[PDB]
Amino acid sequence: SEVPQVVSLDPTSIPIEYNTPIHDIKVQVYDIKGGCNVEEGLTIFLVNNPGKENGPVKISSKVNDKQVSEFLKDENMEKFNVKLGTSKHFYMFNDNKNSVAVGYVGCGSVADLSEADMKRVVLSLVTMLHDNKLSKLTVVFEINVDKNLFRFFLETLFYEYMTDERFKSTDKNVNMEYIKHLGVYINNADTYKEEVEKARVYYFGTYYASQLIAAPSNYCNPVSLSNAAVELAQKLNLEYKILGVKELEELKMGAYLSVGKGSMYPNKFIHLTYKSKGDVKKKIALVGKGITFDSGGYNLKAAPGSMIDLMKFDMSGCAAVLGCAYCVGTLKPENVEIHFLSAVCENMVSKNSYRPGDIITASNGKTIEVGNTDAEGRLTLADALVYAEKLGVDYIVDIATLTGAMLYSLGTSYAGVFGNNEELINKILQSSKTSNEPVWWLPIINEYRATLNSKYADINQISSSVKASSIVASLFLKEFVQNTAWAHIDIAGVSWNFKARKPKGFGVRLLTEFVLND
Amino acid sequence: SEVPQVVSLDPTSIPIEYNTPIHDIKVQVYDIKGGCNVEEGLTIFLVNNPGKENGPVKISSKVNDKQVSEFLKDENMEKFNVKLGTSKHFYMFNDNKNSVAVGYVGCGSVALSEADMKRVVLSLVTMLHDNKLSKLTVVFEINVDKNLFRFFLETLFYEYMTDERFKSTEYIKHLGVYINNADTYKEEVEKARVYYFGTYYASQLIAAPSNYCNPVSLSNAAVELAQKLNLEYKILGVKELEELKMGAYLSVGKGSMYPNKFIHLTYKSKGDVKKKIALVGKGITFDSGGYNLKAAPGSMIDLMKFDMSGCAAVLGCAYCVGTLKPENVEIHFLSAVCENMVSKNSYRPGDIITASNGKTIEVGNTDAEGRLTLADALVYAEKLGVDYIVDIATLTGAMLYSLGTSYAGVFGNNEELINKILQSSKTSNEPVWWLPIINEYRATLNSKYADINQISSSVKASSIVASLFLKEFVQNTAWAHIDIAGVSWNFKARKPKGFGVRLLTEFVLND
Amino acid sequence: SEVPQVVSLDPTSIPIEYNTPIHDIKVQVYDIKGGCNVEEGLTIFLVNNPGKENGPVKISSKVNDKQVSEFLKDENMEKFNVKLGTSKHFYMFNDNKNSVAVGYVGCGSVADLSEADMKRVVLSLVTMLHDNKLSKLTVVFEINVDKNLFRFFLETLFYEYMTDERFKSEYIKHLGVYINNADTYKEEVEKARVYYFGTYYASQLIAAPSNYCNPVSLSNAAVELAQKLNLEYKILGVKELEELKMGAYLSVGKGSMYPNKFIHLTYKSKGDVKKKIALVGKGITFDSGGYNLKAAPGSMIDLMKFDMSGCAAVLGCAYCVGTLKPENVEIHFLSAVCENMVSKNSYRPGDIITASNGKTIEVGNTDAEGRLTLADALVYAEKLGVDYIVDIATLTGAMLYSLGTSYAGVFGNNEELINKILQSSKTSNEPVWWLPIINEYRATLNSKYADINQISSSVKASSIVASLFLKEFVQNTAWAHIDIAGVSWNFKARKPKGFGVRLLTEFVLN
Ligand SMILES: O=C(NO)[C@H](NC(=O)[C@H]1[C@H]2C[C@@H]3C[C@@H](C[C@H]1C3)C2)c1ccc(-c2cc(F)c(F)c(F)c2)cc1
Ligand SMILES: O=C(NO)[C@H](NC(=O)[C@H]1[C@H]2C[C@@H]3C[C@@H](C[C@H]1C3)C2)c1ccc(-c2cc(F)c(F)c(F)c2)cc1
Numbered sequence A: 001s002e003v004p005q006v007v008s009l010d011p012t013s014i015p016i017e018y019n020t021p022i023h024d025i026k027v028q029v030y031d032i033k034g035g036c037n038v039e040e041g042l043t044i045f046l047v048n049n050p051g052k053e054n055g056p057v058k059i060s061s062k063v064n065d066k067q068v069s070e071f072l073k074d075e076n077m078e079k080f081n082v083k084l085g086t087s088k089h090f091y092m093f094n095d096n097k098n099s100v101a102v103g104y105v106g107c108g109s110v111a112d113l114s115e116a117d118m119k120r121v122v123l124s125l126v127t128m129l130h131d132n133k134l135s136k137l138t139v140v141f142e143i144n145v146d147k148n149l150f151r152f153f154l155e156t157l158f159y160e161y162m163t164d165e166r167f168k169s170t171d172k173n174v175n176m177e178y179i180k181h182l183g184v185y186i187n188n189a190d191t192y193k194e195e196v197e198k199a200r201v202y203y204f205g206t207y208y209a210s211q212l213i214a215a216p217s218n219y220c221n222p223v224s225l226s227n228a229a230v231e232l233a234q235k236l237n238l239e240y241k242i243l244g245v246k247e248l249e250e251l252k253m254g255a256y257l258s259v260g261k262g263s264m265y266p267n268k269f270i271h272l273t274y275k276s277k278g279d280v281k282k283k284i285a286l287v288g289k290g291i292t293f294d295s296g297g298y299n300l301k302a303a304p305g306s307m308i309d310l311m312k313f314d315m316s317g318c319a320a321v322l323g324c325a326y327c328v329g330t331l332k333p334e335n336v337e338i339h340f341l342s343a344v345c346e347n348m349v350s351k352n353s354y355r356p357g358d359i360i361t362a363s364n365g366k367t368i369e370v371g372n373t374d375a376e377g378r379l380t381l382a383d384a385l386v387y388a389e390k391l392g393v394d395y396i397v398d399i400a401t402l403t404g405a406m407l408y409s410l411g412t413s414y415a416g417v418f419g420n421n422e423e424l425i426n427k428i429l430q431s432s433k434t435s436n437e438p439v440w441w442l443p444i445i446n447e448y449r450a451t452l453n454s455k456y457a458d459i460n461q462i463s464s465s466v467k468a469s470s471i472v473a474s475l476f477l478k479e480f481v482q483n484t485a486w487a488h489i490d491i492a493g494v495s496w497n498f499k500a501r502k503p504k505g506f507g508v509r510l511l512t513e514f515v516l517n518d
Numbered sequence B: 001s002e003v004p005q006v007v008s009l010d011p012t013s014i015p016i017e018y019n020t021p022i023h024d025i026k027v028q029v030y031d032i033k034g035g036c037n038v039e040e041g042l043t044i045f046l047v048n049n050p051g052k053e054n055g056p057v058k059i060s061s062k063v064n065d066k067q068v069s070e071f072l073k074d075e076n077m078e079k080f081n082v083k084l085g086t087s088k089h090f091y092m093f094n095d096n097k098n099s100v101a102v103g104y105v106g107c108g109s110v111a112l113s114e115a116d117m118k119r120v121v122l123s124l125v126t127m128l129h130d131n132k133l134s135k136l137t138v139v140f141e142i143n144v145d146k147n148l149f150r151f152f153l154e155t156l157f158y159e160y161m162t163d164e165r166f167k168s169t170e171y172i173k174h175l176g177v178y179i180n181n182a183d184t185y186k187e188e189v190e191k192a193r194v195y196y197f198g199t200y201y202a203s204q205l206i207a208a209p210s211n212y213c214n215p216v217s218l219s220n221a222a223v224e225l226a227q228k229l230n231l232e233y234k235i236l237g238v239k240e241l242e243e244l245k246m247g248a249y250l251s252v253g254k255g256s257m258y259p260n261k262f263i264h265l266t267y268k269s270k271g272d273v274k275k276k277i278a279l280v281g282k283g284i285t286f287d288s289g290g291y292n293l294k295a296a297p298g299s300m301i302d303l304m305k306f307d308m309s310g311c312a313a314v315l316g317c318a319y320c321v322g323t324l325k326p327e328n329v330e331i332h333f334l335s336a337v338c339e340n341m342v343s344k345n346s347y348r349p350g351d352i353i354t355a356s357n358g359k360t361i362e363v364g365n366t367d368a369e370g371r372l373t374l375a376d377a378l379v380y381a382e383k384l385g386v387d388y389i390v391d392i393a394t395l396t397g398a399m400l401y402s403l404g405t406s407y408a409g410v411f412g413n414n415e416e417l418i419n420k421i422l423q424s425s426k427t428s429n430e431p432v433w434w435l436p437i438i439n440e441y442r443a444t445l446n447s448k449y450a451d452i453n454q455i456s457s458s459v460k461a462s463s464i465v466a467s468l469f470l471k472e473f474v475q476n477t478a479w480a481h482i483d484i485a486g487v488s489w490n491f492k493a494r495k496p497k498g499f500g501v502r503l504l505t506e507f508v509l510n511d
Numbered sequence C: 001s002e003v004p005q006v007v008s009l010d011p012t013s014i015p016i017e018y019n020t021p022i023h024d025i026k027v028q029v030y031d032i033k034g035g036c037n038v039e040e041g042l043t044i045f046l047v048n049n050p051g052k053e054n055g056p057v058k059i060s061s062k063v064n065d066k067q068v069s070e071f072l073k074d075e076n077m078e079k080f081n082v083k084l085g086t087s088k089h090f091y092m093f094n095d096n097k098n099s100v101a102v103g104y105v106g107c108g109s110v111a112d113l114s115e116a117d118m119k120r121v122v123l124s125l126v127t128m129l130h131d132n133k134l135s136k137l138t139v140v141f142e143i144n145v146d147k148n149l150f151r152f153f154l155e156t157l158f159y160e161y162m163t164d165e166r167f168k169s170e171y172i173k174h175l176g177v178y179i180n181n182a183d184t185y186k187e188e189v190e191k192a193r194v195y196y197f198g199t200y201y202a203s204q205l206i207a208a209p210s211n212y213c214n215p216v217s218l219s220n221a222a223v224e225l226a227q228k229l230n231l232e233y234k235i236l237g238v239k240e241l242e243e244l245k246m247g248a249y250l251s252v253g254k255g256s257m258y259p260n261k262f263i264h265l266t267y268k269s270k271g272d273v274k275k276k277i278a279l280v281g282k283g284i285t286f287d288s289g290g291y292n293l294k295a296a297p298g299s300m301i302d303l304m305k306f307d308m309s310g311c312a313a314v315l316g317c318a319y320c321v322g323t324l325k326p327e328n329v330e331i332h333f334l335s336a337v338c339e340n341m342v343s344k345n346s347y348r349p350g351d352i353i354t355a356s357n358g359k360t361i362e363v364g365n366t367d368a369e370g371r372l373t374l375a376d377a378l379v380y381a382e383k384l385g386v387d388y389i390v391d392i393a394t395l396t397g398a399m400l401y402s403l404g405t406s407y408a409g410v411f412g413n414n415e416e417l418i419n420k421i422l423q424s425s426k427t428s429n430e431p432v433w434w435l436p437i438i439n440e441y442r443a444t445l446n447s448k449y450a451d452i453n454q455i456s457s458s459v460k461a462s463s464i465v466a467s468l469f470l471k472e473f474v475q476n477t478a479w480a481h482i483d484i485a486g487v488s489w490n491f492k493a494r495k496p497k498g499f500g501v502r503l504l505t506e507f508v509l510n
């Protein structure tokens, strides 16, 4: 519980925003068939033009205002085209003699927007909300989207609109006003109304994960992060337990404890639980890799391109799981019991650190020969998986920033899923589809398993010959799941949004949809 | 004050020689218009030959010994030339029928800059090595102004002196100089000897390895220097640094076994104080790189005891100024001393740390630690209420590629200050070149999360980016920044130069 | 003059656009007193807010349109801030029920913009231009600007607006500027349009890939340009170069399939010649590094079509000079053009070669080919009997570490000349900084076997060592050297800068 400091200026907790400006936006959804009122703030039309690439803008909604309708006639709109991401602002006086702002965002010629397409549309919208003080935004859907796409639109709008300023001091943004109101006009509005607060919930789970991830390693360390988890748990009425180093010792988690040996922060193992009232038909363990900083240890990340300064991101898995805990504990699904786990620690260089060559002992009794101290994540997951399976659960799913190789196999958009069970793997892919968080199935190639045979220990931690690191790491983890359906989601390549210089909070929505659809 | 040790064999202070053999040299300046008495020791003529390529050696000076006069005849010296750096030894018997020794050092054709003179002195010094002599006599047959004559002496003393503090397993006693208008030059002699020691003192600290020279022992050394000079002094410990909120500077020091010690000396003139100056020195006693470990080929980790050269320069200057006692000024000598190490307690890449002026900083690379310590030292300096702040630092390796090993670079926010630094470079004979603070690059220091980024992810002109970083930590005071990373260590001679002591003292005195 | 080909599909000329849509834009300058008219197209106000960082937009100019005035009233514009480069533009109906777009570009909180600042402002302007179909841009200056900064604005606007599409498989026709004391600025317009093209032309040669822009085709371009400007011209081939004994220059080109070509254009004033000037551009069409191959990571071998950026700057200046026709001057535009390649015929590390002035040189690294070609170009320049020799060259990577991508370095043996280059830098708004030639380093070029070393094996101040090497080939003439290795390529925008054209022209003109 008590956070150790080297000097008194050292942070003793992670600053966390719960009540964001997003939560104070009133959202009303109207059915477009009754005509739009254009009275104030900024009103934006989402417009496409099927078949005609960069075709003209034609506004098809009924607008309950003559002056605004006059302005929006197709003769006046013909000069503008629907090229995806394009936008324009208009200015005019409505019938009540009040100035209003109107505009549109282009959605292209394909009548079916992908997640990536919709993200580009939301990002254009957000540029319109920035550097303009508005009290209200109104969005008019003149494209077709299903309920899942509609929620994704909101989540993405909320997340991208919110600005993280916890660590600004003298350099706040002086003109950062937020709208207080969001209006939405859409066909068959009644069926979309329920997606609003779900979106609001999914947004905060993501944003919450994002806050933890972006929080630097001095602020976010194993004690302060496990402290953050308790506090979250206390707010959602989840059972929680935090296992300290001595409880970890009696459980014999030598693989996990070895990784943390060189840190000034004691290892902390997070265990949150949500249980439905009534009959529990499904028991699930979600495991998140929680390395608050990864220097590589004695295999120091010193090589060019190793990006040691990003390595605060190595607890993204853990963050996704705690954000999932927020969503699950908030939306309170039935017929399920979910354990939220994370073996939280820091991989450091010290006289106390574990060394390359060290043979260590996992809690299932297997000896492991460390080949590289920078493959610390799989060692922590090993003990966490053994703990997970001892809970007697139906599914074990881990999510982790595990291997750099993901950048070379799938890149920055798709996470890879590996697993020992096809039904479980298809359930993740379905959740991938409905969370709109992209995932691709990659194989566990058993032919490589023999390169993990250690001459002295039971098993090698790393291969000395296979370069398919993401696959080898999956093989190693499989060795610690005895007889349970298990899946592994590697998010090393997708966790961090390099272009925006911020986390994505990737996985929160994937994991929650997974829980809900079960 | 107490120096922590890991083993009982770890040193608890820096050995420092205050009274050097150079100090035991009696110096006499004579007018050459009165003739030379070549009787004892070794007598050397500094000869030129204006314009005439590698002209012959011509002895212009009058010599009060008939015998030597015969030897030094124009006929005898014609087979010798005046090539810059060349030398010959002469042996003879004088009018007294006593054995004497004579020779010359060639000074070339051009009637000499700093770099020229050095090669002259290194030739002289070679003659003083591997020959036991009780006195050296030097006859000028070249023309030097007063600043250049002092440079000759400073450089002679510095290169002659040999640092033996770390060895375990015959200096001359008199220096005679023959020069025209000798009376104008005499005043320069003890000024040179002071400048020599402030320089050699800076060299001692720098050359002292990091197990001898740590934040505690260096700051004890500063106190000991203050007490001997009767300077006022205050050493800030971790508790007061915490109270002063020096979060940037304390972050760098987190990983070390030696507590941070902030050095603050003050010289104040009696009478009316007209100019208040803060001199700030980078004082990293060892730079491992931290978690951005200096492990790349060419990063030269074994050199990094030198990373407190700025502090050395400032303390060296304190000796000079405390000795020469100028009027009308108050000088604050500052250095945020710490060690940058790898430890469970070290600061990490990515960390967000808060400076004493309230500014949050995203750390991009733990090896850019110099500018973090300077940030809080600069906030401190400006709070003193001064007119000028000059910092000097082994800040960026890029200096080697811009100016190389000869010229330091100065940056600043004030043209008048920069000119004064440049004018001081001229009279101190420590070359500096003015480099621009290019504001176009400032946008890359914008952090997504913190008030400011420590480093740029896209601009390769490191010296300028660092200068832009420091500028954020001076609000409304004339400031300049001397980057001595390239010029501080002499790779040829394998020793410090003590670069900047003379430069900063000339700046102080001239104001 | 005939371009050799490996296969029949290899290009044999560099495509050039001489007539550009910028040349068809009608530019009018109006005084701000009297009020602004807002009748069509896009009207942009350039606005700052002194002292108030990210402070609100305030429009002070009278606008002779009641609808647009309403839009520009204080209570509506303060919704926006003046943060440098920030923009907003809106479509509305004006008094005549005509659709006009009105907006602004934030010019920050500083009352006198720098060249980098103005560039950020223009980029924000061009974004709106590229994103709207427009017949007219009207720009209203509510910020302070001197004649040279006004011209620099137009120049940059034209350059950044222009899109180079030669290698791919609707611009405005009117530009209106409102500004106080409009009459003092009007003369800058056609000057800007000429400076723009010299820069754009230089841009075209640089961007042209090495299979397109080779020594033979680049010299052909220069002939074509000189013919269009009635400049005298002479292209030296290998036979003449051999007779002139240009051994350093020829050695660099040995490995290429393209023969060396030496460009020599000359402008002469109608009246008496009072000043003779030689401009010497480095012209390596492609630098593979030679046997010291650019294989090290970060050496950016795919960029090395830019290694003729100096020659390009020289030829753009020739366009400007031949067009504006300075008086009392004679100017020689020179470039020793070749290609540094790997082959059985290449020169080798360790080779000792003989420059045209008799100095033997020990090659230490074949990727230091630029100073080799410049040595013979400088000798050739001095044999002309000129008053100033000024060279411009992508010479040393180290410039990225000293000045970066914004400022070029200038080195020289003469302080009058350097202060002229410096002054030219100020009036052209092409930022340059004076760097020293440190003589203490000269000894590292003392070869054991040859007269001189091409490189130092010890000193790391490369841009200074190269300056020292080039100094050896200029005996008694005022000379300056502008290293543009760092500043020549706009990495952010993925295109050339045409850097140096305007700087060399201002030097020639003023
Ligand atoms: O340190 C790691 N996990 O704790 C992990 N290391 C690996 O994937 C490789 C490394 C370390 C090992 C030995 C061998 C195969 C495996 C294990 C090379 C890893 C994970 C992410 C990244 C990574 C690096 C980036 F630059 C980046 F932009 C990113 F998104 C991820 C790099 C290495
Ligand atoms: O450690 C330094 N300051 O505390 C400094 N480092 C840098 O300039 C690099 C480091 C820290 C930065 C981020 C990135 C680029 C820049 C700035 C790596 C630095 C200073 C001197 C030297 C240096 C190295 C030599 F081999 C040498 F001979 C010398 F004289 C100086 C190298 C790096």
Ligand SMILES: O=C(NO)[C@H](NC(=O)[C@H]1[C@H]2C[C@@H]3C[C@@H](C[C@H]1C3)C2)c1ccc(-c2cc(F)c(F)c(F)c2)cc1
Pocket: C287, C298, C299, C300, C303, C307, C365, C367, C368, C369, C370, C394, C395, C396, C397, C398, C400, C455, C462, C485, C486, C487, C489
């Ligand atoms: O090849 C060159 N000129 O023909 C030049 N080369 C060098 O400066 C190297 C060559 C020649 C020298 C000795 C040693 C180090 C230095 C100086 C190898 C040079 C010029 C531009 C660049 C360069 C590289 C970049 F990646 C880049 F973005 C840029 F703008 C310039 C790199 C090297």
Ligand SMILES: [Zn+2]
Pocket: A294, A296, A373, A374, A375, A376, A377
């Ligand atoms: Zn790792």
Ligand SMILES: [Zn+2]
Pocket: B287, B289, B366, B367, B368, B369, B370
């Ligand atoms: Zn460092």
Ligand SMILES: [Zn+2]
Pocket: C287, C289, C366, C367, C368, C369, C370
């Ligand atoms: Zn080259």
